[PDB]
Amino acid sequence: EAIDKREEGIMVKQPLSIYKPDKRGEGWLKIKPEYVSGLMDELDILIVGGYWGKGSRGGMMSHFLCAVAEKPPPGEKPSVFHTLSRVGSGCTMKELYDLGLKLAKYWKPFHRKAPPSSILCGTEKPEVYIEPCNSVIVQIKAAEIVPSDMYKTGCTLRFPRIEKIRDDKEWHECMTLDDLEQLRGKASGKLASKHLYI
DNA sequence: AAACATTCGTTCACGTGAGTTCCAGTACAAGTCTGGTC
DNA sequence: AGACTTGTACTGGAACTCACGTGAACGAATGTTT
Numbered sequence: 001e002a003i004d005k006r007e008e009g010i011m012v013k014q015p016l017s018i019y020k021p022d023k024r025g026e027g028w029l030k031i032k033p034e035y036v037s038g039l040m041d042e043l044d045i046l047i048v049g050g051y052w053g054k055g056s057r058g059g060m061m062s063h064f065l066c067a068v069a070e071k072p073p074p075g076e077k078p079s080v081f082h083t084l085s086r087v088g089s090g091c092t093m094k095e096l097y098d099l100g101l102k103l104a105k106y107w108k109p110f111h112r113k114a115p116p117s118s119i120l121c122g123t124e125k126p127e128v129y130i131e132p133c134n135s136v137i138v139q140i141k142a143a144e145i146v147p148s149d150m151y152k153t154g155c156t157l158r159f160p161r162i163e164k165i166r167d168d169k170e171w172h173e174c175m176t177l178d179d180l181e182q183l184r185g186k187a188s189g190k191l192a193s194k195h196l197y198i
Numbered sequence: 199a200a201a202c203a204t205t206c207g208t209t210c211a212c213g214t215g216a217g218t219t220c221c222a223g224t225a226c227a228a229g230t231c232t233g234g235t236c
Numbered sequence: 237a238g239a240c241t242t243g244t245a246c247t248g249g250a251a252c253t254c255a256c257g258t259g260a261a262c263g264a265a266t267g268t269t270t
Contacts, residue, residue, distance in 0.1 A: 024227075034238090055231065056241085063232060088232035089239045143237085148234075159237055160233055 003033055003192050033192035034143055034159075041183070041191050042163060044139045046174040048081055048119045049110065049126025050103075061100045063088030065126045066138060067119060068153060069174050077172055081119050081132060082152040084180070087140055090162025099136065099165055106134050123150040135171045139163040144190040145183070153177070155184060 002010050009032030017027025033039045045066045053062025067081035091099065110129040115121060118132055140160050148156035175183075187193035 053231080057231070086233065090232095092240070146234080150234085156234065158234070161238060 003039075003195065006188070006190055008032065034141065036196060039192060039194050039196060040141055040143075041194075042139050043142050043157070043183075043191075044137050044166060044169065044174065045084060046081065046132060046171055047103075047130065047135045047138055048083065048132065049129050050107070051127050057093075057096070060097060061103075061128075062096070064138070065124065066140075068177055068180050069132075069172075070177050078174075078176075079118060079132070082177060083119070083121055083124070084151060084153050084155070085140075085142075085148075085157040085160050086124070087138060087160050087162050089160075090140070091165070095165065102136070103130055103134070106130055120152055122152045132171055137166045137169045137171065137174060139166055142191055144192075146189070153180065155180070 002008075009030055012029045012031065014027035020026055045068050047064050048067040049065035050061040051063050051065070052058075053060055063086055065083055065086050067083045069078035070080040070082065072078040072080075107128045107130060110116075110126050112125055115125070116129050116131070119129055139162065140157060141163050142157035143159040144157075145155050146158055147154060150156070183191070
């Protein structure tokens with residue numbers, strides 16, 4: 001019912017539970033479509049930019065800016081991209097280092113005065129831009145789609161998190177802009193639009 | 199009187215169960231990095 | 237919000253050792269039979 005009502009989950013409480021400040025779970029629990037496996041629709045999209053990390057992840061790429069591809073003419077590959085959102089979490093340290101090494105040599109500095117033709121940005125400009133012909137397809141378990149004025153697509157993902165840097169799929173198998181619009185209109189925002197059967 | 203068995207009696211090797219030390223794997227709390235909007 | 241890293245604790249499995257039990261080789265001594 002919560003999913004059908006476009007809600008954000010449910011909360012379960014024990015009748016005998018007592019109030020204990022600063023306790024992460026003593027009788028109060030939260031059930032959301034994110035936790036259940038398979039209910040959400042994973043979003044696989046390309047990587048078009050990266051940013052330098054801060055703190056422990058100093059000398060490496062900590063977060064990345066991803067873009068969806070447009071609809072090319074029949075028999076032609078997509079050469080135009082629109083930025084969707086930014087992903088910083090979901091990748092382990094070893095996987096993050098491997099991804100950085102895989103694209104360390106292909107990284108190219110980004111200049112605001114001369115934005116790349118292949119990648120078109122909105123208000124957020126990546127520090128380093130990478131051309132699309134050589135990139136990995138990152139999978140993100142987005143919670144919902146909200147209207148964003150900082151990206152060309154006009155929409156962004158709430159609580160984005162990387163799930164896997166897929167290697168089987170190539171750079172040309174990313175989502176299309178029409179596919180993104182269809183997904184947005186499927187449930188008017190929240191991606192969780194599937195019931196649970198057991 | 200000699201040979202066999204038998205016996206028999208022993209003892210050694212091998213196998214199974216209980217206690218002790220060490221380390222791999224798992225659960226929980228907190229720090230740390232990162233996402234977006236007004 | 238979320239996910240990963242760090243720590244802390246906590247436990248169960250593996251390896252080692254010893255005690256108990258058993259099987260069975262065998263070696264020789266003795267008794268019986270021819």
